[PDB]
Amino acid sequence: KKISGGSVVEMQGDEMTRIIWELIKEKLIFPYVELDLHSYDLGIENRDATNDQVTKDAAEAIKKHNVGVKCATITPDEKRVEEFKLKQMWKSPNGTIRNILGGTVFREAIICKNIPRLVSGWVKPIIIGHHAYGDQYRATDFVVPGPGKVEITYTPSDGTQKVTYLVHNFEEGGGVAMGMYNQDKSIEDFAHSSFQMALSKGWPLYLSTKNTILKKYDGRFKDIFQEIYDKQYKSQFEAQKIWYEHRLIDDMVAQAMKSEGGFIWACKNYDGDVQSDSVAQGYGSLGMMTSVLVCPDGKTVEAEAAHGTVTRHYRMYQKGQETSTNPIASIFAWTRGLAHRAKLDNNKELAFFANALEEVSIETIEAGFMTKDLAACIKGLPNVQRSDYLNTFEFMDKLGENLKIKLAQAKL
Amino acid sequence: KKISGGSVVEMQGDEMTRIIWELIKEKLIFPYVELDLHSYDLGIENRDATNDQVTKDAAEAIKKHNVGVKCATITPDEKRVEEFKLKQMWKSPNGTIRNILGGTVFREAIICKNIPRLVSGWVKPIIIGHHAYGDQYRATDFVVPGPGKVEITYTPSDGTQKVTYLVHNFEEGGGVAMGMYNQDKSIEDFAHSSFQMALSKGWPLYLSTKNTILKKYDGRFKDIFQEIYDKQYKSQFEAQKIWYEHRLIDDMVAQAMKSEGGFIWACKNYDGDVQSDSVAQGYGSLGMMTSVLVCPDGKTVEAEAAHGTVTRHYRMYQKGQETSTNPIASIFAWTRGLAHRAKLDNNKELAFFANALEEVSIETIEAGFMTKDLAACIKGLPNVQRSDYLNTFEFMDKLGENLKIKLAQAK
Numbered sequence: 001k002k003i004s005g006g007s008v009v010e011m012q013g014d015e016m017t018r019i020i021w022e023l024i025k026e027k028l029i030f031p032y033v034e035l036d037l038h039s040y041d042l043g044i045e046n047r048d049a050t051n052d053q054v055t056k057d058a059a060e061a062i063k064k065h066n067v068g069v070k071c072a073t074i075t076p077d078e079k080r081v082e083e084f085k086l087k088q089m090w091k092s093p094n095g096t097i098r099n100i101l102g103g104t105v106f107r108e109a110i111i112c113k114n115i116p117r118l119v120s121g122w123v124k125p126i127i128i129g130h131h132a133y134g135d136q137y138r139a140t141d142f143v144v145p146g147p148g149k150v151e152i153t154y155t156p157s158d159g160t161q162k163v164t165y166l167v168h169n170f171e172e173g174g175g176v177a178m179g180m181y182n183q184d185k186s187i188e189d190f191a192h193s194s195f196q197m198a199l200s201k202g203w204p205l206y207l208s209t210k211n212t213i214l215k216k217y218d219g220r221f222k223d224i225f226q227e228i229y230d231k232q233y234k235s236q237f238e239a240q241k242i243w244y245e246h247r248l249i250d251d252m253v254a255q256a257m258k259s260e261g262g263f264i265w266a267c268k269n270y271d272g273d274v275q276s277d278s279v280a281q282g283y284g285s286l287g288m289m290t291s292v293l294v295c296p297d298g299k300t301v302e303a304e305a306a307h308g309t310v311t312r313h314y315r316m317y318q319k320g321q322e323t324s325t326n327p328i329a330s331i332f333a334w335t336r337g338l339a340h341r342a343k344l345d346n347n348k349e350l351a352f353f354a355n356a357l358e359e360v361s362i363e364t365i366e367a368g369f370m371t372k373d374l375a376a377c378i379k380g381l382p383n384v385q386r387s388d389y390l391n392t393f394e395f396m397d398k399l400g401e402n403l404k405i406k407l408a409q410a411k412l
Numbered sequence: 413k414k415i416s417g418g419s420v421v422e423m424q425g426d427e428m429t430r431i432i433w434e435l436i437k438e439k440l441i442f443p444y445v446e447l448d449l450h451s452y453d454l455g456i457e458n459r460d461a462t463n464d465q466v467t468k469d470a471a472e473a474i475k476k477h478n479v480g481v482k483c484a485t486i487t488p489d490e491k492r493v494e495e496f497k498l499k500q501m502w503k504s505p506n507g508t509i510r511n512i513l514g515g516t517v518f519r520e521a522i523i524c525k526n527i528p529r530l531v532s533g534w535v536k537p538i539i540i541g542h543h544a545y546g547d548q549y550r551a552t553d554f555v556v557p558g559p560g561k562v563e564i565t566y567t568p569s570d571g572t573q574k575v576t577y578l579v580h581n582f583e584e585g586g587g588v589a590m591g592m593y594n595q596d597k598s599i600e601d602f603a604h605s606s607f608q609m610a611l612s613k614g615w616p617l618y619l620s621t622k623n624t625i626l627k628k629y630d631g632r633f634k635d636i637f638q639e640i641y642d643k644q645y646k647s648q649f650e651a652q653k654i655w656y657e658h659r660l661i662d663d664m665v666a667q668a669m670k671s672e673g674g675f676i677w678a679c680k681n682y683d684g685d686v687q688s689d690s691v692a693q694g695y696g697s698l699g700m701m702t703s704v705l706v707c708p709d710g711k712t713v714e715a716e717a718a719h720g721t722v723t724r725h726y727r728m729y730q731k732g733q734e735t736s737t738n739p740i741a742s743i744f745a746w747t748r749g750l751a752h753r754a755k756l757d758n759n760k761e762l763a764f765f766a767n768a769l770e771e772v773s774i775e776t777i778e779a780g781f782m783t784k785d786l787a788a789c790i791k792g793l794p795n796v797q798r799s800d801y802l803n804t805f806e807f808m809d810k811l812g813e814n815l816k817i818k819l820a821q822a823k
């Protein structure tokens with residue numbers, strides 16, 4: 001009776017998300033789906049015990065099977081190290097997994113017709129693709145104490161004459177100086193990932209750069225994106241009635257606000273980092289934002305919620321108090337992974353189920369059963385009442401009932 | 413009869429704005445106000461004629477008198493040179509003026525209750541202060557052909573104990589690399605104007621940086637602001653129930669969208685550049701954006717519309733077709749400069765008039781009299797009708813008539 005799932009790699013998470021994650025699998029997924037499951041505990045204690053070995057093993061497994069579903073994880077910081085008595089301040093699991101996999105992360109927010117938005121106009125998804133190999137985020141930056149000259153020099157490994165340029169001469173006073181770089185392969189991968197995501201998504205693609213100011217530096221991003229599109233992707237875009245274009249960031253943010261959504265926006269690392277929160281904020285609650293990591297090959301996908309472990313809610317949970325935490329992003333992480341898995345294996349039965357969960361989840365909210373954060377959006381935070389929303393367990397049950405009804409209705 | 417304005421420096425502009433500028437003076441300012449007016453023609457032909465000396469003359473004049481009102485001016489490009497056959501491809505007047513004055517531009521958009529905005533929340537002005545001296549805008553960026561080592565080095569004037577930082581070593585392939593800088597002094601001036609602007613306008617001030625990512629580079633911006641504030645302005649802010657705080661940029665944009673407005677936002681040069689276009693748009697039409705330039709001393713202010721010459725409208729006007737160009741931003745430049753002059757001169761009447769002009773202009777729109785861009789905001793772009801909006805002359809005349817009535821009751 002159960003659908004045959006295929007092979008998926010599952011990673012367990014931390015805190016509030018973890019409680020939901022088990023609930024989602026137990027009620028939402030396992031009953032109707034059978035999977036070959038490779039399960040890794042990415043929970044902070046396990047990561048600590050394994051030395052972060054488990055995280056690496058999990059990342060490798062995703063490469064082997066091509067599909068990953070992930071739960072939000074604690075990212076170690078000094079307070080955390082003190083809290084868990086961690087052996088070391090471990091690197092973020094997302095950071096490690098992205099590093100091993102390569103590929104680019106795209107964040108999109110689920111939209112419900114009843115829920116209001118900061119930007120009312122945005123009735124279609126806007127998807128942000130983030131280039132996380134950073135010009136800014138891998139940068140050499142320093143204070144300039146006193147008058148001096150700052151120069152940037154490139155030395156060819158081939159023994160060709162080295163080139164030096166004077167960034168500035170500080171005749172008087174202090175300054176701040178910086179050096180940053182980007183590499184052709186990362187940009188190339190990023191472009192390949194974005195074209196493929198758009199083609200898979202069904203939406204048009206834009207890339208934003210301040211290429212007018214920084215003709216050489218941002219020109220490479222623009223040039224690489226054009227070169228790849230023309231050579232390998234354009235006809236497919238033509239067939240699917242969608243396009244790729246390059247936009248200046250000032251134009252794009254303004255255009256995006258005016259716009260009704262429905263596009264994939266490809267962002268350089270600084271732009272993407274700013275964009276990811278802002279776009280989510282415009283849409284609504286963080287509970288409704290999902291992250292998908294997509295590699296250049298297009299075979300491999302890792303899906304996780306955009307939001308974190310939701311510690312503030314979890315603390316209430318520990319205290320024995322009631323919580324209303326949104327599972328939609330976490331639920332959607334599963335559905336997206338399943339859909340890709342269905343896509344790779346050409347499994348319609350799985351594909352149908354992954355969609356069915358998404359429809360059910362939206363339909364339930366659209367009918368007025370929702371977590372507190374959603375309720376706040378319609379009411380306003382002050383005006384929300386306990387009757388207005390379901391608690392975390394209550395919402396999942398309503399979702400479970402609906403999922404059962406929906407699937408049965410489909411049969412026949 | 414006529415209020416005594418005091419000394420003002422007025423610069424004529426180009427194209428459509430120039431036509432409006434004459435209309436504003438003729439029907440709005442001159443009848444009720446008498447000024448010591450020093451007038452420079454920044455219109456493109458005159459600028460070409462004088463080799464752009466006049467643009468320099470105006471900037472020097474503003475420093476002397478402390479107040480300038482500016483019409484939008486054409487900034488030359490290869491296309492422009494052919495059209496006017498100019499001798500040289502002249503640099504932008506704002507840039508020339510800005511360089512001579514020093515100072516930081518602040519962009520404020522007028523708010524009308526009737527007009528819808530992309531962000532539902534904003535009911536209060538958000539003012540963006542932009543740091544023109546640029547790390548990005550004065551940077552050396554180069555393509556990297558092949559495997560190489562890229563390094564950034566600082567050498568002290570004495571030449572002792574230089575530091576070398578290796579940005580990257582390209583083992584395989586090619587990339588782009590860049591180096592950028594900023595000045596302690598430029599940042600210091602930028603901070604001073606922003607603080608003075610906040611105190612002057614009675615709003616809280618926020619400075620945004622990526623200091624978590626770029627601790628040394630961003631932090632200086634962050635450090636200089638706190639140090640100046642703690643030393644000089646903090647006491648004044650507390651008296652006025654006002655505060656200054658620093659935000660990470662992602663936090664600031666998200667917080668701003670959720671916000672209702674009412675703050676001054678100080679921006680890094682790249683951040684400001686992105687902010688200016690979007691923020692005006694989020695509020696409404698570009699015709700509603702004004703662009704004051706304020707020096708660190710706080711004595712000296714320059715007022716102009718945020719928008720350009722509006723040539724697309726101008727071409728239609730030339731063709732004999734109908735035009736609906738918003739004068740609100742241009743009108744406000746006059747009002748805001750005058751408000752500064754009144755402050756400097758302690759003139760109650762000049763101060764009263766400037767507010768009345770602003771008040772009337774908002775009131776007129778709120779009543780449902782407007783140009784096409786605003787009507788588009790209310791009705792949606794494709795649903796606008798001729799009945800909805802007033803033509804550029806129609807609007808100005810209504811403003812003149814409404815202003816006269818408003819002034820009349822004061823008497």
Ligand SMILES: NC(=O)C1=CN([C@@H]2O[C@H](COP(=O)(O)OP(=O)(O)OC[C@H]3O[C@@H](n4cnc5c(N)ncnc54)[C@H](OP(=O)(O)O)[C@@H]3O)[C@@H](O)[C@H]2O)C=CC1
Nearest residue numbers: 072073074075286287305307308309310311312325326373
């Ligand atoms: N995907 C990942 O692996 C990520 C993990 N993290 C980790 O999360 C931990 C703590 O995260 P934090 O910084 O607090 O940010 P979170 O992503 O947990 O979000 C914090 C706040 O956002 C709102 N929120 C987020 N998700 C939900 C949800 N599902 N339902 C309802 N409200 C939600 C809540 O607002 P309110 O305050 O109103 O309750 C909550 O207080 C950190 O260890 C961090 O490392 C962080 C980012 C990404």
Ligand SMILES: NC(=O)C1=CN([C@@H]2O[C@H](COP(=O)(O)OP(=O)(O)OC[C@H]3O[C@@H](n4cnc5c(N)ncnc54)[C@H](OP(=O)(O)O)[C@@H]3O)[C@@H](O)[C@H]2O)C=CC1
Nearest residue numbers: 484485486487698699718719720721722723724737738785
């Ligand atoms: N402060 C200054 O001196 C500035 C001058 N300029 C100069 O202006 C010239 C042309 O600038 P351009 O790039 O066309 O941009 P503009 O600022 O002139 O405006 C461009 C578009 O914005 C809309 N718009 C702007 N002002 C108004 C208004 N008052 N009422 C209604 N709509 C308005 C119009 O949109 P629509 O097309 O929908 O009508 C117009 O087509 C250039 O030479 C440029 O250098 C530019 C920027 C600043």
Ligand SMILES: C[C@@H](Nc1nc(N[C@H](C)C(F)(F)F)nc(-c2cccc(Cl)n2)n1)C(F)(F)F
Nearest residue numbers: 253256257271278279665668669683686690691
């Ligand atoms: C008007 C809005 N400003 C703003 N909006 C965006 N993106 C929005 C999510 C959207 F595109 F949807 F409008 N991005 C930026 C920004 C700033 C600095 C650097 C970069 Cl790269 N981007 N600023 C504010 F402030 F009101 F929120």
Ligand SMILES: [Mg+2]
Nearest residue numbers: 201202203262
């Ligand atoms: Mg589609």
Ligand SMILES: [Mg+2]
Nearest residue numbers: 318319320321
């Ligand atoms: Mg208790």
